[PDB]
Design an enzyme around this catalytic site. Sequence first.
Site, PDB file in Angstrom:
ATOM      1  CB  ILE A 169      10.537   1.386  -5.653  1.00  0.00           C
ATOM      2  CG1 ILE A 169      11.858   0.835  -6.190  1.00  0.00           C
ATOM      3  CG2 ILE A 169      10.065   0.609  -4.438  1.00  0.00           C
ATOM      4  CD1 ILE A 169      12.974   0.851  -5.170  1.00  0.00           C
ATOM      5  N   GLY A 170       7.727   2.686  -5.609  1.00  0.00           N
ATOM      6  CA  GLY A 170       6.451   2.873  -4.949  1.00  0.00           C
ATOM      7  C   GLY A 170       5.967   4.299  -5.087  1.00  0.00           C
ATOM      8  CE  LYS A 171       3.299   8.099  -9.302  1.00  0.00           C
ATOM      9  NZ  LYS A 171       3.130   7.789 -10.750  1.00  0.00           N
TER      10      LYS A 171
ATOM     11  CG  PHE B 142       5.643   9.908   0.445  1.00  0.00           C
ATOM     12  CD1 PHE B 142       6.713   9.761  -0.428  1.00  0.00           C
ATOM     13  CD2 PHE B 142       4.949   8.777   0.830  1.00  0.00           C
ATOM     14  CE1 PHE B 142       7.080   8.516  -0.897  1.00  0.00           C
ATOM     15  CE2 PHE B 142       5.313   7.533   0.363  1.00  0.00           C
ATOM     16  CZ  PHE B 142       6.380   7.402  -0.502  1.00  0.00           C
ATOM     17  N   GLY B 143       4.860  11.517  -2.308  1.00  0.00           N
ATOM     18  CA  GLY B 143       5.678  11.612  -3.500  1.00  0.00           C
ATOM     19  C   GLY B 143       5.912  10.254  -4.131  1.00  0.00           C
ATOM     20  CD  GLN B 144       6.954   9.650  -8.807  1.00  0.00           C
ATOM     21  OE1 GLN B 144       6.052   9.723  -9.641  1.00  0.00           O
ATOM     22  NE2 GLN B 144       8.237   9.686  -9.137  1.00  0.00           N
TER      23      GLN B 144
ATOM     24  CD  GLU C 248      18.590   0.170   5.607  1.00  0.00           C
ATOM     25  OE1 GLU C 248      19.217  -0.881   5.349  1.00  0.00           O
ATOM     26  OE2 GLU C 248      18.309   0.524   6.772  1.00  0.00           O
TER      27      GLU C 248
ATOM     28  CG  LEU D 232      14.581  -1.502   3.894  1.00  0.00           C
ATOM     29  CD1 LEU D 232      13.558  -0.830   4.795  1.00  0.00           C
ATOM     30  CD2 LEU D 232      15.585  -2.307   4.701  1.00  0.00           C
TER      31      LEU D 232
ATOM     32  CG  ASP E 155       0.437   6.116   7.317  1.00  0.00           C
ATOM     33  OD1 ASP E 155       0.124   4.943   7.016  1.00  0.00           O
ATOM     34  OD2 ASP E 155       0.198   7.090   6.571  1.00  0.00           O
TER      35      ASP E 155
END
Length: 345
Positions: free
Chosen positions: A35-37, A40-42, A109, A111, A157
Site C-alpha cells: 500500500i505505502g512506503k 518507518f518501513g512499509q 484498520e 482507511l 509529522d
Amino acid sequence: KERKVYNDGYDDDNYDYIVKNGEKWMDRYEIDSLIGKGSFGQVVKAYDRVEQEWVAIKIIKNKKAFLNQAQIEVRLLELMNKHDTEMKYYIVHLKRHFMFRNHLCLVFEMLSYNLYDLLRNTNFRGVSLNLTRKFAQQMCTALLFLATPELSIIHCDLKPENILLCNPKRSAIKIVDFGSSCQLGQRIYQYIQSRFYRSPEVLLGMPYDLAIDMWSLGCILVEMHTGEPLFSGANEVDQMNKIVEVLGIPPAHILDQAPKARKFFEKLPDGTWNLKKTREYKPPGTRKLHNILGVETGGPGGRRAGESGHTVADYLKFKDLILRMLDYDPKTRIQPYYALQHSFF
Ligand SMILES: CCN1CCN(C(=O)Nc2cc(-c3cn(C4CCOCC4)c4cnccc34)ccn2)CC1
C-alpha cells in the site's frame, strides 16, 4: 558489488521486508499487496482471516533503531485508544501488534486514500472551500484530543500523506503515523517536522510544544484549497525565507531567544532584526495571503469564480483563521478549543 543475504532472504538491502504477494503469515493474515512506503518501513493490504475483516499492517524495518521508535508508537496508540470519548475515532485504530520474522508488525484498520491523493485526483486545482472547512473542523477536533492533559502528544509529522480518508466518498478523515511523535516533556529530537510544514520554532531550534502541529495544519489547509504547498521551501534557509515572505520578519523577542537565529537573520546595531545579506525572494511581507487565497479575486488562481459557498466574506474568515494558526509565537498561536469556535465553522 555486494550480493549478500539479508535475514535469510526475507529482508532487502534496506532493513525492509521483501513483500511477496499472496503470503499467508502465521496462519491468519493474507498479505494482498503493498500500500505505502516510508522511513518507518512499509504498509500492506491484508485480510485478518480470524475476524474476516480487512486490515493494514505496518511492517517496521528490521533495525533496533526503527524497532525502538516503533515501540513508542505502539505505546501512544495504545494509550490513545484507551481514553473513552468520541474523539479517539479521529485517530487510526491500532488493533494489535506482533513480531514476525524479526519485524515488528502493527495491525491497523483499513482507511482509504490520503489527502494528497484526493488533491492529485483534482489535478492540484484544490478542493472546494466547504470541503476544506470539513477537514479543518476534524483536524482541530483531533488536535484537541492529543492536547488532553493525560496525553499531551505532539504528532511532529503532520502532512497530507498522514491524513487518510475513512471512505473513498470523502469527509471522514483520520491521522495515521505517530512514529515521529513524543509526549510533551519527553521530547527527544530537533529535526522533526516535514520541511514544507515545519514551524518557525523548530526552524530556529527553540523548544517546541504542541503548537507546532497547528502550524502544520495551517499550511495543510491552504495547500488543500490552493493545490500548491504554501511554504514550498527546498531547504531550511529557503524555508525560513519563504515564511518571512508572507508573515514578515519574525518578532525580535523570538529571535533574541532563538539559538539558530544566526542561520537566517542578523541583528543590526539598531537592534532591529533583519535577514542575512546576499535577489531571490520577494521583499518580506509582500507575498500576502490575501492573494494566495484570492479572497477578492476569483478564489485561488481565479478557478473558483462563480461557485456556491466561495463568498468573499467566507474567505476573510478562512484567511483570518490561517493567520491565527501561523502566529509565529507559539504562546499566542490559536488553540483547538478556541479554533473550533472561530467564525469559520
Ligand atoms: C482501495 C485501496 N486503498 C485502500 C488502502 N489505502 C491505504 O492507504 N490504507 C491504509 C494506510 C495506512 C497507513 C499509511 N501510512 C503511510 C503514511 C506515509 O505515507 C505512506 C503511507 C501509514 C503510517 N503509519 C500507520 C498507518 C499508515 C493505514 C491504514 N490504511 C491505500 C489503497
